[PDB]
Design a binder for this molecule. Structure first.
Ligand SMILES: NC(=O)c1ccc[n+]([C@@H]2O[C@H](COP(=O)([O-])OP(=O)(O)OC[C@H]3O[C@@H](n4cnc5c(N)ncnc54)[C@H](O)[C@@H]3O)[C@@H](O)[C@H]2O)c1
Ligand SMILES: NC(=O)c1ccc[n+]([C@@H]2O[C@H](COP(=O)([O-])OP(=O)(O)OC[C@H]3O[C@@H](n4cnc5c(N)ncnc54)[C@H](O)[C@@H]3O)[C@@H](O)[C@H]2O)c1
Ligand SMILES: NC(=O)c1ccc[n+]([C@@H]2O[C@H](COP(=O)([O-])OP(=O)(O)OC[C@H]3O[C@@H](n4cnc5c(N)ncnc54)[C@H](O)[C@@H]3O)[C@@H](O)[C@H]2O)c1
Ligand SMILES: NC(=O)c1ccc[n+]([C@@H]2O[C@H](COP(=O)([O-])OP(=O)(O)OC[C@H]3O[C@@H](n4cnc5c(N)ncnc54)[C@H](O)[C@@H]3O)[C@@H](O)[C@H]2O)c1
Ligand SMILES: CCOC(=O)[C@@H]1CCc2nc(C)sc2C1
Ligand SMILES: CCOC(=O)[C@@H]1CCc2nc(C)sc2C1
Ligand SMILES: CCOC(=O)[C@@H]1CCc2nc(C)sc2C1
Ligand SMILES: CCOC(=O)[C@@H]1CCc2nc(C)sc2C1
Lengths: 267, 267, 267, 267
């Protein structure tokens, strides 16, 4: 398999529609040995991950919790066995309070809410790299999830701002990761119909925001020369596995677009 | 003059080497009527601004203070006279705690420090636009100060991340400002020898950081096809005035580079 | 005026809807003294330019003609008077054979046609700078016209490829122009309803191409935070004059977008 | 292997230091069945390719020859057997006359020379896709070789302009290739010490050009967070194979940077 013998940490599973669930599934189909991390609802996450092709230890990780971050490398080492290190790290963590996304005006998001969103969605990519680089092998790979923020768009609002910050954070993490012989890259995915996104498109954060995101999804598939299927995270999961593999060994501080090529076309 | 009859708010003056001091001077030489805003050291700022070509009211504005932001439009209206509105707004505000810039490792900046830096340097661009758009005239212009964050660089660290967030914020502010017939743009300046930058290059945030920034400054002038004079903020001030004028009326959500053309050249 | 006392060469006038006609008109309203250049239909161009606010000498220039290029500086000097040099140069020249634009498949444009289009639209920007830099003053400015080619789009086909080459050419021209204290920049305009574009939208190069360009124009105005009026070249002309002025003195090898901010927004 | 059972055409082998020689070697180590194409010196190319891990048919292809292009799909079909189609296409073709690269001034490259360089280096990417798309399988992949032309640089001159045109061509080829379920992407490699590049660095195109390219190579490795080894094309070859594989299935019209991450860092 593509990832035979690799030890990979995968964060971000919350439902069976999580992009990280599909990353974990594909990595296991490709021979990777995984360690999973989960936030807050660990009983739910264990029940979800019982459906993965192979059994994997699940560790708690709230990226806003400094104690969780400080003990993370020790907890991972205990799970993978002393003398073993990770070959890969997947950051598939993102959050923005409802005041920072949807119909709520861009100017009406309080800073405490924007700050929480940037902490979870951007700063934590550096927090995770800091915690895990001392237990990573040379030739290793750190991958985060991006949503192309080069241009503004309706409804995504402060989540787009957080993604612009994440892209910048990734370039600095690459400088640090390079000292360990480790790569740091992001996968910029097209929109995916996760449970939260289906709810948002359904109007959970206002009607106009749902209508605008539905138009964005349609335009994405129209612009993509190979099309874009929002109900299928497998092409995104495969791209993350390509970066975790030994097949992109000279790519770092960079962004790989798994978006059907939509960002390369205007119409 | 370029800005004859225009009413322009200028934030960010702290010393006679502040980029905003030169923006204010050039705007006044060009016939603009100014309102200045200052943070914390108002006695110092008044003494500095006494050296400007013309007298201008000075209002206190701490962008982290919600009360200052809530009363700002009323305080500006009182200063410019009832029935008058602003034609221009200059955001020349930036800050990052020393833990987020310099020799302190990128991974060692606590989030509370990064968050303060992003609040002042990025979020406040939206806070200022929210406060002042209701008192701006159609054809108006909002300008912020940028430092090209497209690629990572030594020492600038979390300030670069904050600038990536500011560029994203600017694109959203442009969407809101457009509803008022107002433009929103950033000027990406080359490095300027302000008092803080001279101190940093002198080793105030560690020797290695000072050495790296000095090399960056030299490389900037070398790459610039027209050269780059870090001791001269006047080309930057002129560029801000070009955006405040009626001469770039179809440019918004954008970045104008006043960097000697250095970002367009590799060597 | 913005361009008081400046001597500026303006190429590219063919009809009263030419972007260059509006650049010439605005530059004259702003106190510039012009020299015009025209291709092939000089009687027509003189009759058109008789409608400009002020009289201006008209010189023949076919950019594919090496003799025209070799004698150009001498012909300009004769027109402006010995001892006088140009302060500005406007390249507003573009062409692509019909095989390289429209419904004709992208793969069906013969190279001789693509090559002619790239010669006129991209290489000539360097040919014009080579011919005129020896007769340009320090502080001078060379401006070319761009159409954002960062992403592919229907119908524009090989014209987009030629614009990608022009943007690259501009960065090299800036290196050469800098030796003379001269800036080189492009203005990336939104779509303008010139006579040829109206004919194209009307189906002159096939129905599907006309339909696609009409959709592009509509989407442009929708995405522009300040809107985009394709029937008005004046905001584009003002932007060219801003670059010809002394108000963007630290910008070179660069692109200024006079597109209503449309390129900064996805939807 | 990564490319088990795939039928891949590889162009561009001229010496054992050709990037295409290493692409061909790695693709064969990964189970691909190859068809090679060669220009002008077919006896030399056969002797070179005798050193590849497996035997592969060699077909003549001068991309400037319309007859070679018109018969190419028929010649490939004869070599791979009737009823078989290609899964992959590698364009590793580049050329610029010496007037367009090196110490010869940028303004001194005659258009006939620039045009030949753009024909071979940019237009031929579309000519090759036109010829081979009718004999490509869905899920297929076309890959071309790029050298980051986003910023101008010394000595590369018109080769950089040709690469800017190639990047634009790639985005249009992706639109056409998508109709066949085929991806089109470029690999932007860091500088490689091929025979021609070693000769250029050695002063074959002037001393100053050699000195500048040597400085560019050094700066590349310095900026790369993981370093850059110009004497090793294997990381570039692996990246091309990643794009030829099924592991980047949602990436098209795009650029993957196999440059040690140097383009993501300023210093
Ligand atoms: N869904 C899309 O359209 C889309 C597109 C591009 C990128 N992405 C990105 O992909 C990633 C995965 O998101 P998803 O769409 O699969 O949604 P998701 O809800 O399935 O996953 C987001 C994850 O973030 C985790 N998380 C939130 N706060 C956390 C905290 N304090 N500590 C640790 N984990 C925390 C959640 O538990 C969840 O597992 C995110 O970075 C997201 O921004 C999503
Ligand atoms: N100096 C450079 O090399 C350089 C280069 C590019 C961009 N810039 C940007 O230009 C702008 C001006 O900075 P400068 O270099 O002139 O430095 P400066 O110190 O002269 O100005 C920064 C200003 O930010 C103000 N400020 C800080 N915290 C504030 C708060 N809470 N509320 C309100 N104002 C606050 C300070 O009072 C000061 O006036 C900043 O956005 C900076 O990032 C600087
Ligand atoms: N119209 C648009 O939508 C649009 C948008 C962005 C940029 N532009 C660019 O603006 C510029 C001006 O074009 P326009 O739209 O005003 O069209 P236009 O037809 O009015 O102008 C193009 C000019 O190119 C000249 N030209 C053609 N071949 C020439 C040659 N061999 N030598 C000298 N001159 C030659 C023509 O005579 C004409 O004056 C071009 O570079 C064009 O690509 C146009
Ligand atoms: N060497 C570098 O530093 C570097 C860096 C980035 C990209 N590249 C690109 O990689 C590709 C391969 O070049 P390389 O460096 O391996 O050099 P190379 O000389 O080994 O390969 C270039 C190939 O182009 C072929 N070619 C030239 N004219 C042709 C024609 N008319 N028809 C068909 N083939 C023709 C040559 O025969 C040769 O095989 C090129 O696109 C080049 O621009 C090179
Ligand atoms: C309203 C907040 O939504 C989220 O945070 C969800 C999880 C992260 C996420 N990232 C996106 C690009 S959309 C989204 C949806
Ligand atoms: C150490 C913190 O320094 C600052 O915040 C100063 C003011 C804002 C600023 N912006 C830059 C691009 S350097 C700098 C210097
Ligand atoms: C079919 C060829 O059309 C042209 O060459 C006209 C003049 C130049 C031009 N540039 C554009 C961006 S559209 C266009 C229209
Ligand atoms: C002087 C012309 O050199 C070439 O054409 C060689 C082959 C193609 C090539 N591409 C590069 C990015 S350098 C180079 C070197």
């Amino acid at each position: 398999g593509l990832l035979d013998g690799k030890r990979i940490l995968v964060s971000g599973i919350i439902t069976d529609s999580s992009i990280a669930f599909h990353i974990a599934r594909v990595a296991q189909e490709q021979g990777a040995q995984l360690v999973l991390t989960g936030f807050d609802r660990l009983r739910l996450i264990q029940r979800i991950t019982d459906r993965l092709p192979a059994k994997a230890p699940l560790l708690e990780l709230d990226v806003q919790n400094e104690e969780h971050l400080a003990s993370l490398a020790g907890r991972v080492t205990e799970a993978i066995g002393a003398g073993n290190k990770l070959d890969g790290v997947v950051h598939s963590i993102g959050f923005m309070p409802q005041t920072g996304m949807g119909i709520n005006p861009f100017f009406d998001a309080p800073y405490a809410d924007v700050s929480k969103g940037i902490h979870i969605s951007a700063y934590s990519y550096a927090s995770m790299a800091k915690a895990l680089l001392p237990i990573m092998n040379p030739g290793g790979s750190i991958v985060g999830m991006d949503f192309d923020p080069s241009r503004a768009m309706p409804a995504y609002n402060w989540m787009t701002v957080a993604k612009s910050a994440l892209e910048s954070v990734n370039r600095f993490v690459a400088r640090e990761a390079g000292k360990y012989g480790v790569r740091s890259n992001l996968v910029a995915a097209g929109p995916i119909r996760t449970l939260a996104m289906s709810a948002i498109v359904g109007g959970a954060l206002g009607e106009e925001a749902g209508a605008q995101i539905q138009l964005l999804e349609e335009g994405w598939d129209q612009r993509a020369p190979i099309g874009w299927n929002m109900k299928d995270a497998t092409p995104v999961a495969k791209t993350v596995c390509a970066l975790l593999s030994d097949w992109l060994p000279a790519t770092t501080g960079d962004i790989i677009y798994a978006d059907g090529g939509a960002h390369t076309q205007l119409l």
